[PDB]
Amino acid sequence: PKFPAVRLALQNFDMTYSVQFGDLWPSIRVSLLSEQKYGALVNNFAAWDHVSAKLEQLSAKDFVNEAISHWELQSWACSPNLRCFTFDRGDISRFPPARPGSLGVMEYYLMDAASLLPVLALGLQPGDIVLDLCAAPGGKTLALLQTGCCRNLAANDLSPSRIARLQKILHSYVPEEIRDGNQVRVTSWDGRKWGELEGDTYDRVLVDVPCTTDRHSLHEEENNIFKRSRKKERQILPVLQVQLLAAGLLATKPGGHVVYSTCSLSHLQNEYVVQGAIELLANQYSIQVQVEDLTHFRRVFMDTFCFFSSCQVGELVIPNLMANFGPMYFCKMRRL
Amino acid sequence: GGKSSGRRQGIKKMEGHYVHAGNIIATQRHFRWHPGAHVGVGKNKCLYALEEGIVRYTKEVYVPHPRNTEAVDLITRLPKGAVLYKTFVHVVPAKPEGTFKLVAML
Amino acid sequence: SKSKNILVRMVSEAGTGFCFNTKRNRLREKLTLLHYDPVVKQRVLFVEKKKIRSL
RNA sequence: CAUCACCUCUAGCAUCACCAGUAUUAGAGGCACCGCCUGCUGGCUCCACGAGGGUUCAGCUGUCUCUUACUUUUAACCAGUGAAAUUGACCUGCCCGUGAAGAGGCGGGCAUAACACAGCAAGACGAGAAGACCCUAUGGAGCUUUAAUUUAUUAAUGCAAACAGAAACCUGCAUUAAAAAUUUCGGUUGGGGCGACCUCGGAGCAGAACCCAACCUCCGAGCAGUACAUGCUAAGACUUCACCAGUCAAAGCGAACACUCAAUUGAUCCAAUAACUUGACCAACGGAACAAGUUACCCUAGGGACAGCGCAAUCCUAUUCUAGAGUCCAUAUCAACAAUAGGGUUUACGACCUCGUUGGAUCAGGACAUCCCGAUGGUGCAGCCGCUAUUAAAGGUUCGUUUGUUCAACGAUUAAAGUCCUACGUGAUCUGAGUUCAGACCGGAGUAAUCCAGGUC
RNA sequence: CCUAUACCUUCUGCAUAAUGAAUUAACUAGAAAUAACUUUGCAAGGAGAGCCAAAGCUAAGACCCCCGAAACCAGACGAGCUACCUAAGAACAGCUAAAAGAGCACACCCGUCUAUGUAGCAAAAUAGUGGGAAGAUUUAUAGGUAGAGGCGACAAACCUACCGAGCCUGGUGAUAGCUGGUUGUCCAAGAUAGAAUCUUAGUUCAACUUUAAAUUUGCCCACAGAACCCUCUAAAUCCCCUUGUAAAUUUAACUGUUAGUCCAAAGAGGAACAGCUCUUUGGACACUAGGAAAAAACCUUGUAGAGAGAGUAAAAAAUUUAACACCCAUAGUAG
RNA sequence: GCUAAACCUAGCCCCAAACCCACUCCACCUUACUACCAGACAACCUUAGCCAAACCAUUUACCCAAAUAAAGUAUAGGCGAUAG
Ligand SMILES: C[S@@+](CC[C@H](N)C(=O)[O-])C[C@H]1O[C@@H](n2cnc3c(N)ncnc32)[C@H](O)[C@@H]1O
Ligand SMILES: [K+]
Ligand SMILES: [K+]
Ligand SMILES: [Mg+2]
Ligand SMILES: [Mg+2]
Ligand SMILES: [Mg+2]
Ligand SMILES: [Mg+2]
Ligand SMILES: [Mg+2]
Ligand SMILES: [Mg+2]
Ligand SMILES: [Mg+2]
Ligand SMILES: [Mg+2]
Ligand SMILES: [Mg+2]
Ligand SMILES: [Mg+2]
Ligand SMILES: [Mg+2]
Ligand SMILES: [Mg+2]
Ligand SMILES: [Mg+2]
Ligand SMILES: [Mg+2]
Ligand SMILES: [Mg+2]
Ligand SMILES: [Mg+2]
Ligand SMILES: [Mg+2]
Ligand SMILES: [Mg+2]
Ligand SMILES: [Mg+2]
Ligand SMILES: [Mg+2]
Ligand SMILES: [Mg+2]
Ligand SMILES: [Mg+2]
Ligand SMILES: [Mg+2]
Ligand SMILES: [Mg+2]
Ligand SMILES: [Mg+2]
Ligand SMILES: [Mg+2]
Ligand SMILES: [Mg+2]
Ligand SMILES: [Mg+2]
Ligand SMILES: [Mg+2]
Ligand SMILES: [Mg+2]
Ligand SMILES: [Mg+2]
Ligand SMILES: [Mg+2]
Ligand SMILES: [Mg+2]
Ligand SMILES: [Mg+2]
Ligand SMILES: [Mg+2]
Ligand SMILES: [Mg+2]
Ligand SMILES: [Mg+2]
Ligand SMILES: [Mg+2]
Ligand SMILES: [Mg+2]
Ligand SMILES: [Mg+2]
Ligand SMILES: [Mg+2]
Ligand SMILES: [Mg+2]
């Protein structure tokens, strides 16, 4: 009670994001205050073929499959074996709750379709070892396991409470045989230690640093980052984003790719953090990285997503009334 | 801020103490004392006497069950010639199981 | 604190009236277990009849 | 505050107020005339007026420099009459020390025939009463409200009842509203603001049986999964220092051939159900079936409170060190990192924000770490002035203007306008401000009552 | 001369400059049930209907205070003071002015400033200086409005010298986890783990303590024995036959106590040398005396009387610090 | 040796028993105790609260007509305190 955390979050966003987006902010603000559209991620382990037919009856369309055929039309590719069904532009229809299949696992998972792009931008390949920092609660973690291109995975999140939610998601969806071995490693440790525990170990690293989540902040009243007690954490939040990304960058082997993802529209936490890590590695550890161009990636998914074309390095997906996916920011940088 | 109190776990019957069937010998968080002769183990690693007699503490060679993967993986990495020892608590029975008594002259 | 599981009551099909409460996932079909019935002193089929509460 | 003037709101009417009245009226309110300006309500100007609050010319004067004289009352003595607060007992000294830390009574020294009378106000933490300061109470009361619990009451309606060729009144039962009624403000964190916290598990955490470090620092838990004999019974024991609760368990019947997991939880009453069984972020987690704020109008019962402790950190002073400034040159002077002594101050957790006695008048006592006067070294001391050091407390250390966590700045002088201590030294000698108050506004806070170390009277 | 820091009460500890007491006399404060115990009667029955009984039952004896709130309610009594109103009356010189809520200024009303006074003349006055003084004035008389209220030019003003809700009586010996008090003699045993709590000013349970009873072990303690970790590491503790000793457990009945303080030691509070706060072990103090100057906590010492006997215990600070070379030196050279 | 100090009745308390009083003259509801003129005025209606529940909000004993016993039993009750 007292001062609502929702209004405090909205006040902070209104001042900051009005300048950044200009006339686009009123359009973004309505989408943020409205409920985000949920995409259906079909579980490959379950009856994926049957569920795909079932979703098409509900007028759902696989945008991922459509984006696959657009690669040759426009003229690293992307992570394969991903099937996500969303509705048409401007359709407010919601998917039914997921149900267990004949195999005992949930048939599909409901998640933001904008959160699949960091997995898609990762360009996952078979036989690789994937490190995910802040993997919990498993929005991006499940997508990596759906691909089946990762022989060894390390899912690390600082909060054990979030980690416990991830394991339950893995148990319900991912069959135990995959989780039985050392293929999926779940730990609760600081990600900044990963820059020293395991250096050059992984070929593909996905770093979704903690950040002020615009969708959750404006709606959730529990553990909001904008409450008075969390003000100290918010002030040091940009510092954490620079350190956690740097640890993930050192963790990968040269010739590997690291994707930095953030669920926010703040430039101080999307572009500045990316530039900070690049400078930090050169100054302290003498590490040089190259940020790839995602413009080719953007032009394929323009049909089902709205993109902001005033970003220095990464790609930002802005929410909209017709396409409510977002906000999502992801940048792919490889180590040389 | 978390507040907790001691669990009062430890040795309940020392060396040479006389115990009866069912008496709890020791309560442990982890297997500090292993069950020996005529000593059972409960769910919470609680040691109770299965027979009435005297409690003895000895050092015995620790040979883990083959099914226990963690303990088998430990002995296989030991240098050749090394032997593991652990403290076992035994109950030495004092009374015989029974005696034959004359009941009739038929 | 989302209610993933619910508490259901299994009623014996032997007609003895013996019933017991078990926990099952909400997103699941009605259970049909093979539980011991003390009245007939043997394992009999049981059927879910009514949900008691959401856990 | 009221006040003409202005403005808002309500009311189309009579036989006890309004009113023996009738919208040019009456009532409930705001604001404070007028004049100007403005919106479709707001801002300035200005006549007089004021025991309002400041400022100022001139004069006036004992307000003062700087007090003095006289008269009257009082006073003191003689005669008559004759109270009150107060009072453990007193055969009632001073200086150091000690001490519930401020000694007439204790320790060590010093002083000391006994008694009135008149003065004095340093002490007897002097006396009376009032009040301030917080704190406490499952103590009160006033006020306010979107605190909880209510509509008995009143008003407006509905249906029933009743009349009935129709209608009302009354009554019963419902539904809104009004105005009231009863009751309460859970703890922890110097206070307030903002937040956090209250149960359970683990670690720093008591190194070795058990228990034990509150506050504090840090991370968790309020699940899930596999079973469906996770059946029924029954020796002996453990136990979170009580109880409640919790834990283990041989044998036996019946089957098969005491589940994982550190925490993963909630009593009684009551409610539902044929039985079985189930029900609370009762999270203030041994739980009240359901109750907030405020008081500077406050009340009652009590408790606490300048002075005192402080060999780590920090600050100051004097030495030590001898790097470095001073043309050269450690030491004429100055001085870094530091060290050793004396003194002051800060301090166990929201690695938040703020807030909790002192001048003056009079009279001074004392210290010297000396501002002036005196004596004596060194000088980058020619001489005059200066700088520095030793010695010296006999004596002296001004008058004004603004302003005042009551202190600085400024003006004119002086051989100098010393640093402190003394329960602000000193309020039973006096007085100003603050602590802050009963009234009142301005600014800010709050739905309001009311509040703010803020501004002012 | 020598020795001796009034009493009560409240706190860890009062000579305390914390509370109470001028003093005398009189008055003034522990009321009761179940159970248990003790002593009689009778006894598988007891009792003067009813009730209890697996030795009980009946009777007696023997245990549970005083004063004090602010309040709340009910019914009365009050507007001769005051607030406002009603009825019918009265008063206001002189002067300047004008048909004035005008000016000056008496009577009169009010009470601005200062001083006196402070148990006073006075539970609000006096002297001087002031505001109003033909008006929204002042004032005499009678009447009205009464406490869940009245009245109010709102000051939370006034309503008979304590009005944030009058006074009196009654409920009422209200209640108070709070303060204070608690009255003959003598002896005996007797102090510091905790938990829960609208709780930390309290209470309940446990621990401790007391009395009675029953029973047999209790304390001290020889080995043996009690975990690995994160690599290592303390004083010790538990258990414990002998032995030295005399207690311990259980049964019955209750009350009372609890933040103790300081000293030694080991620690704890963001990795804080002291200090503050908080644990642990031990001691002392809240019990005596002697000694450290006076002295609750240091040291010596505890079982109680009389003696004009004796032997002892602890028990009195050390320290005074700075002399010193004599003689000589040309040169391959400014390597 | 002053002030004083001492005293034993007055009467009262609790029971039993029995059901008590009020016109001498005059005055007395108007301003009571006031000799002496048109009134029309008339009575009846749950107690509450303190307190206990360690707050408080439902609730909380108060002779109702025979001592004893049934019996603090059946019942009632934030199924609490307590009531019966
Ligand atoms: C914004 S969430 C992203 C969740 C997930 N990446 C997804 O999109 O599905 C970021 C999470 O990172 C975790 N986190 C915060 N700090 C971290 C740290 N220092 N190291 C690792 N994880 C951290 C937090 O628990 C938080 O839930
Ligand atoms: K005035
Ligand atoms: K009360
Ligand atoms: Mg006004
Ligand atoms: Mg002036
Ligand atoms: Mg002048
Ligand atoms: Mg003269
Ligand atoms: Mg005389
Ligand atoms: Mg007297
Ligand atoms: Mg004398
Ligand atoms: Mg003294
Ligand atoms: Mg003396
Ligand atoms: Mg004096
Ligand atoms: Mg006094
Ligand atoms: Mg209390
Ligand atoms: Mg109140
Ligand atoms: Mg126990
Ligand atoms: Mg509570
Ligand atoms: Mg509690
Ligand atoms: Mg507990
Ligand atoms: Mg005020
Ligand atoms: Mg001189
Ligand atoms: Mg000197
Ligand atoms: Mg002056
Ligand atoms: Mg002046
Ligand atoms: Mg004085
Ligand atoms: Mg004295
Ligand atoms: Mg004292
Ligand atoms: Mg006295
Ligand atoms: Mg009441
Ligand atoms: Mg009360
Ligand atoms: Mg009158
Ligand atoms: Mg006039
Ligand atoms: Mg006049
Ligand atoms: Mg008036
Ligand atoms: Mg007012
Ligand atoms: Mg007021
Ligand atoms: Mg009065
Ligand atoms: Mg009393
Ligand atoms: Mg109390
Ligand atoms: Mg004794
Ligand atoms: Mg003797
Ligand atoms: Mg020589
Ligand atoms: Mg009560
Ligand atoms: Mg109360």
Side-chain angles (χ1 to χ4, degrees):
Chain A
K2 301 180 178 181
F3 310 98
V6 163
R7 192 171 191 271
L8 294 174
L10 187 53
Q11 287 183 197
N12 189 263
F13 293 159
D14 194 4
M15 299 174 58
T16 304
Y17 298 163
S18 59
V19 184
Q20 183 172 355
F21 298 101
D23 186 73
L24 296 179
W25 170 243
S27 57
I28 297 177
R29 183 175 174 177
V30 179
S31 55
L32 289 180
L33 295 178
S34 301
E35 182 59 34
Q36 55 175 349
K37 189 179 305 181
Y38 287 86
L41 178 62
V42 186
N43 185 12
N44 296 330
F45 305 105
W48 57 272
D49 52 353
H50 298 295
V51 176
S52 178
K54 175 186 176 182
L55 295 184
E56 290 170 356
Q57 304 176 17
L58 301 182
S59 177
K61 303 176 183 177
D62 185 8
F63 66 94
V64 184
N65 183 28
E66 302 171 359
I68 288 178
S69 59
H70 299 163
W71 287 84
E72 306 291 342
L73 299 172
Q74 180 176 349
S75 180
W76 60 292
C78 61
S79 60
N81 304 332
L82 284 181
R83 305 182 183 94
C84 187
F85 287 75
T86 55
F87 294 95
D88 193 3
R89 301 293 292 266
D91 185 8
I92 71 166
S93 303
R94 52 163 58 95
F95 283 102
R99 302 284 298 183
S102 298
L103 287 78
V105 295
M106 312 295 296
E107 50 187 4
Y108 52 77
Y109 187 87
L110 297 185
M111 60 176 298
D112 183 14
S115 180
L116 192 66
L117 273 63
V119 177
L120 287 171
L122 190 53
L124 217 56
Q125 301 171 175
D128 299 2
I129 302 181
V130 182
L131 166 66
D132 192 2
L133 294 85
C134 314
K140 299 174 179 55
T141 318
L142 178 58
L144 299 175
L145 288 171
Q146 290 294 338
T147 63
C149 301
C150 38
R151 62 203 308 178
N152 298 327
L153 298 87
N156 170 84
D157 190 303
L158 178 58
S159 181
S161 179
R162 308 298 295 268
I163 278 300
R165 300 172 57 179
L166 164 62
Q167 294 179 169
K168 296 174 181 55
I169 291 184
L170 298 185
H171 174 87
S172 55
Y173 284 80
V174 177
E176 200 272 347
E177 305 92 26
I178 287 87
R179 302 181 296 103
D180 197 7
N182 62 330
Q183 316 173 202
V184 185
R185 187 180 63 183
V186 180
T187 61
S188 66
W189 288 320
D190 188 11
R192 295 168 290 187
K193 302 301 182 61
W194 248 256
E196 302 139 352
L197 266 290
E198 297 294 336
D200 300 353
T201 308
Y202 318 90
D203 292 356
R204 300 299 159 83
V205 181
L206 180 53
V207 193
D208 186 2
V209 302
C211 182
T212 64
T213 52
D214 303 357
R215 183 69 56 174
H216 300 278
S217 302
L218 301 179
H219 299 346
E220 298 172 347
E221 202 69 18
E222 174 268 345
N223 196 30
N224 239 23
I225 181 61
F226 286 99
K227 75 176 187 180
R228 301 302 178 87
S229 182
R230 291 254 289 181
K231 179 178 178 59
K232 299 182 58 57
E233 300 184 9
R234 186 173 68 262
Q235 236 70 13
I236 64 184
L237 180 60
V239 181
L240 262 180
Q241 300 188 4
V242 180
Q243 298 171 337
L244 288 175
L245 177 55
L249 290 174
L250 293 177
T252 193
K253 190 181 295 299
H257 311 78
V258 179
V259 174
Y260 168 83
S261 182
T262 300
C263 181
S264 70
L265 296 173
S266 55
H267 54 77
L268 297 178
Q269 310 169 238
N270 294 7
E271 289 78 5
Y272 286 72
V273 174
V274 165
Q275 298 293 150
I278 300 181
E279 273 76 304
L280 178 60
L281 292 186
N283 300 330
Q284 187 173 6
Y285 304 96
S286 180
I287 303 300
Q288 183 266 354
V289 300
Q290 177 270 345
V291 170
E292 298 183 7
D293 188 11
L294 298 179
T295 309
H296 177 90
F297 186 83
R298 174 201 303 172
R299 302 169 186 268
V300 183
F301 294 89
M302 270 291 303
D303 54 325
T304 56
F305 295 95
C306 302
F307 296 90
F308 187 64
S309 179
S310 301
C311 300
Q312 181 75 14
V313 272
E315 187 60 35
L316 177 59
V317 181
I318 56 179
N320 199 263
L321 275 180
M322 298 187 63
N324 213 336
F325 316 114
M328 178 60 61
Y329 172 86
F330 57 95
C331 175
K332 176 176 184 175
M333 53 195 74
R334 72 178 304 179
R335 182 178 182 177
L336 301 175
Chain B
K3 311 169 188 178
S4 299
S5 180
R7 289 201 164 188
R8 282 74 183 174
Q9 286 176 331
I11 292 294
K12 309 301 175 186
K13 296 289 185 176
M14 285 289 179
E15 166 84 2
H17 286 208
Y18 194 88
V19 298
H20 307 276
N23 284 23
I24 287 176
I25 297 180
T27 54
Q28 330 158 347
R29 307 173 190 268
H30 310 279
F31 273 104
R32 175 170 178 187
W33 307 277
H34 289 252
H38 304 98
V39 171
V41 50
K43 273 187 53 177
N44 49 2
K45 307 175 183 58
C46 171
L47 300 176
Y48 60 97
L50 287 162
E51 295 291 338
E52 176 175 345
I54 298 295
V55 170
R56 299 298 179 181
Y57 293 85
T58 63
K59 309 291 188 186
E60 307 298 329
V61 177
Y62 178 74
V63 180
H65 198 282
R67 292 300 180 178
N68 189 7
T69 302
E70 298 185 7
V72 169
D73 187 71
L74 191 146
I75 58 178
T76 53
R77 299 188 299 175
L78 293 176
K80 193 171 184 179
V83 171
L84 297 191
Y85 282 82
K86 280 178 170 55
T87 302
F88 288 77
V89 44
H90 319 269
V91 173
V92 180
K95 304 171 183 177
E97 304 85 352
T99 57
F100 305 93
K101 291 180 176 180
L102 182 63
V103 299
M105 296 299 304
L106 303 178
Chain C
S1 60
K2 304 177 184 178
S3 59
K4 185 178 182 179
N5 298 326
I6 64 175
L7 188 62
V8 300
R9 173 162 55 193
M10 309 295 297
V11 175
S12 176
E13 285 281 3
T16 64
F18 181 81
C19 60
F20 71 103
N21 304 328
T22 187
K23 169 185 58 182
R24 75 169 180 91
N25 196 329
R26 171 192 303 273
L27 304 170
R28 194 171 180 174
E29 294 185 356
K30 302 178 183 179
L31 294 184
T32 303
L33 294 180
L34 191 65
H35 193 78
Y36 169 76
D37 196 328
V39 187
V40 293
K41 302 179 179 300
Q42 64 180 92
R43 292 176 296 271
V44 205
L45 281 179
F46 282 69
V47 286
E48 168 187 349
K49 288 302 182 180
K50 178 186 302 182
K51 185 203 68 175
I52 298 299
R53 58 156 298 185
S54 302
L55 306 182

